[PDB]
Amino acid sequence: ECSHRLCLGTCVAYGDGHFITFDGDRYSFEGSCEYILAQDYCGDNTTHGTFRIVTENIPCGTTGTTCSKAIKLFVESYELILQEGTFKAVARGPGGDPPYKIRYMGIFLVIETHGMAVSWDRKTSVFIRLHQDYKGRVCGLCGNFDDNAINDFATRSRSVVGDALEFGNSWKLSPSCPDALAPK
């Protein structure tokens, strides 16, 4: 007999491109451009959604194998770039109080939004923990959080594929960017 407290869904984006989406699916994708790690901006109405998280692989001393990440935590009209070891703020829209909070959780930058907490190890792993409210209404490379892991390979046009490369290639920000070839 277990207490019935809700538990936060968890997406994990780490390493050379391993992802463990919200629904528990696991795969590997070696992408080089900017990829939407999450967003509410997918639906018959995009504009009732709030946040958006993009990531891409920074090399820290060369242009080769990845060494760190670059996160873009958009929250409504705000914005936070996570790179190079700390955060920034490029707030452009309405200038109210922050809908986020920032904390130094051990070896992590943790940024909360009262229902959506992002933890960044400051080098290459991102763990995102969401409230149960956002269930089924998110998308990107952390699946759609529907407790249905088979169809989490749902691309931009929601054409569930059996391949990881197409699913990753769908969520690149700039269509000009070249698609990643076969990972080796």
Binding site: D23, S32, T63, A149, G162, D163, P175
Partner: protein, 715 residues
């Protein structure tokens, strides 16, 4: 925005530094256009070479060195680390493209280099490079007029300044440009003043001063009169980069531009052109105005077939590299998706769930939660745990020295709460209620028959179908009418389209790993609990290593027969299965071919007819067939029998995934003796009486004939 993190080079040798300076410098050699030179380790080294095209001042070669990457742009071509590359070329942190009218090289967190190809070239630099750069672009300290031109406390002319930042070739001695004599012309017609001070750049007057640009426009007027618009273009770029919105100044006479039929040439268009591949890219962009071709609002770009900007609801869709004009549909085995609304509108056809146990150890459940099970007991493979309607049991037995060497040994379908028990062994023996029963058998709606010598089909009316493989070893497959969704229990999971609930035990919690979950479903309390296995048997024998590698690699080979299913089923778990089996299997060929057969059968379940994959492998399963039979890759029906063609058969009314195996060839039939003879040699059967072929007989006032095994009666 990009307030003072920009430098530029345009037109008749006009250089603009980060902090706002402008000066003309008619150099004609290689120069350090910018460089990280006040740091212990340099990050970027961008150099320009300026030359003449007949008389036009151009940039003939750029050499960007950054973080061990060398990028030489010249002659309309790009060299990346010494090798020519086709645009666009992208890598971690780097991307070079032919975007718009230019060549843009963005080295993320380092720089953004635009090069129009002939004369313009613009650098955006990170804010962290302030005060640590040196070159024609200045020092990036923010102070324009005071610190670029003081070489040891002496003020220099732009000729001297540009001559300081000079760099000869290894064997080259390029001179310095002798000062140009006085100018003439100025803006007599007032074109520079009329345009630059005109309406278009109104708010640009609030960000970037036009004095130097006015002078440069006049000076270019002194040069050819088809090349005065370079300064206006540069002022547009600078105004856009400061943050202001430039307005369209181009008129059919003022350096007219052209764009494709659906694309308009705009100054200050949104950089992220929405395109129905990503029709909402332009939602929350961050980038200032950019000039180029754009689309009228509403009709996003079509980057899928390049038909120009197209309406959102008439542009194609893409699936697996295949183009689908909107209006088309494509149905998978499990769902159908139509290309409409700029998206895929997907509905689901009902899909029978599929559990399977392959290799005697690996289990792929209904939720497709593949997991390994090294156990030695009878495990409840599946059970509608509301009732005891059906209960598929599997007995997994240890087959070697190692505790992780298992083989499936039986499949015991209990039924009606244990009233009936159909037990398929590993030799092919089928026991109905613990009594030998040959095949086929049709009773109590249960139908047992062999589509081929490799498989046994146990079809029931309760909903589940068992398809059991005997050759090359024992594997089991289970199909469920989707009606039982979210109702079952057992090893194969509750079939509710959720991979995180598959390890739900009878105690209401999700179990951790495979073996810990399985040890709750053992049939007998006296069994030994399964144990988690980390040690890969592949590490033991190097010859086993090379054998398993060289054969199981046939799975992921893109030129292999299996490639046709790669774009549908990810073959990584199947390759892991093949590796683990072959390395651990005493009969390496048996487990190897079992893995390959498993991959083929799974793919054929998804609806792909993999064929001829046994090239130089597993051919001893071609040859070992029973006499008068033969192999067949697509066996997709019952077995053609003389009795069946004579008097129909309940057997052939069962739909099962097309398995391969040994069967009689087409145009032949197997008589009750089992030998394979053509139709002419097998008899028609009336009332169970063997009525020989081609034989006219009398019965009940009627005359009958047996033609080609077919019975006909007259009168």
């Amino acid at each position: 925005a990009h307030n003072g993190r920009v430098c530029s080079t345009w037109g008749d040798f006009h250089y603009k530094t980060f902090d706002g300076d402008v000066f003309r410098f008619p150099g004609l050699c290689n120069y350090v256009f910018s460089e990280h030179c006040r740091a212990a380790y340099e990050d970027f080294n961008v150099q320009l070479r300026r030359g003449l095209v007949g008389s036009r001042p151009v940039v003939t070669r750029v050499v960007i060195k950054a973080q061990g990457l060398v990028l030489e742009a010249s002659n309309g071509s790009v060299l990346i680390n010494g090798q020519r590359e086709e645009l666009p070329y992208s890598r971690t942190g780097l991307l070079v493209e032919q975007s718009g009218d230019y060549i843009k090289v963005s080295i993320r967190l380092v720089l953004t280099f635009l090069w129009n190809g002939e004369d313009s070239a613009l650098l955006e630099l990170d804010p962290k490079y302030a005060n640590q750069t040196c070159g024609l672009c200045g020092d990036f300290n923010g102070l324009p007029a005071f610190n670029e031109f003081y070489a040891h406390n002496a003020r220099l002319t732009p000729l001297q300044f540009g001559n300081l930042q000079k760099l000869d070739g290894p064997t080259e001695q390029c001179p310095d440009p002798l000062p140009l004599p006085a100018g003439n012309c100025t803006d007599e017609e007032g074109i520079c003043h009329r345009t630059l001070l005109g309406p278009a750049f109104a708010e640009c007057h609030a960000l970037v001063d036009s004095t130097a640009y006015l002078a440069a426009c006049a000076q270019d007027l002194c040069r050819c009169p088809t090349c005065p618009c370079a300064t206006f273009v540069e002022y547009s770029r600078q105004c856009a980069h400061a943050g202001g919105q430039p307005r369209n100044w181009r008129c059919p006479e003022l350096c007219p531009r052209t764009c494709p039929l659906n694309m308009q040439h705009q100054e200050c268009g949104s950089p992220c052109t929405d395109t129905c591949s990503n029709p909402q890219r332009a939602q929350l962009c961050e980038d200032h105005c950019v000039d180029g071709c754009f689309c009228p609002p509403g009709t996003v770009l079509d980057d899928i077939t390049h038909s120009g900007c197209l309406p959102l609801g008439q542009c194609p869709c893409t699936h697996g590299g295949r183009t689908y004009s909107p209006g088309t549909s494509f149905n998978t085995t499990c769902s159908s998706c139509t290309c409409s609304g700029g998206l895929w509108q997907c509905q689901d056809l009902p899909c029978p769930g599929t559990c399977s146990v392959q290799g005697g150890a690996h289990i792929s459940t209904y939720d497709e939660k593949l997991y390994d099970l090294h156990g030695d007991c009878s495990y409840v493979l599946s059970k509608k745990c509301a009732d005891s309607s059906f209960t598929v049991l599997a007995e997994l037995r240890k087959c070697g020295l190692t505790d992780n060497e298992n083989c499936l040994k039986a499949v015991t379908l209990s039924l009606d709460g244990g009233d009936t028990a159909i037990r398929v062994q590993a030799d092919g023996g089928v026991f109905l209620n613990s009594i030998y029963t040959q095949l086929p058998l049709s009773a109590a709606n249960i139908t047992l028959f062999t589509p081929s010598s490799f498989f046994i089909v146990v079809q029931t009316g309760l909903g589940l179908q068992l398809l059991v493989q005997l050759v090359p070893l024992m594997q089991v497959f289970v199909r469920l009418d989707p009606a039982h969704q979210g109702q079952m229990c057992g090893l194969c999971g509750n079939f509710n389209q959720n991979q995180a609930d598959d390890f739900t035990a009878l105690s209401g919690v999700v179990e951790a790993t495979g073996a810990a979950f399985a040890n709750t479903w053992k049939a007998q309390a006296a069994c030994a609990n399964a144990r988690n296995s980390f040690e890969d048997p592949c590490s033991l024998s190097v010859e086993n290593e090379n054998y398993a590698r060289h054969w199981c690699s046939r799975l992921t080979d893109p030129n292999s027969a299996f490639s046709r299913c790669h774009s549908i089923i990810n073959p990584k778990p199947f390759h892991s299965n093949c590796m683990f089996d072959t390395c651990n299997c005493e009969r390496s060929e048996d487990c190897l071919c079992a893995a390959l057969s498993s991959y083929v059968h799974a793919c054929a379940a998804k609806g792909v007819q993999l064929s001829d994959w046994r090239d130089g492998v597993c051919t001893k399963y071609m040859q070992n067939c029973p006499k008068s039979q033969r192999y067949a890759y697509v066996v997709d029906a019952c077995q053609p029998t003389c009795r069946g063609l004579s008097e129909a058969d309940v057997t052939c009314s069962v739909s099962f995934v097309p398995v391969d195996g040994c069967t009689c060839p087409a145009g032949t039939f197997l008589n009750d003796a089992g030998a394979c003879v053509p139709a002419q040699e097998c008899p028609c059967y009336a009332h169970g009486t063997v009525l020989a072929p081609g034989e006219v007989v009398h019965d009940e006032g009627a005359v009958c004939s047996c033609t080609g095994g077919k019975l006909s009666c007259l009168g």
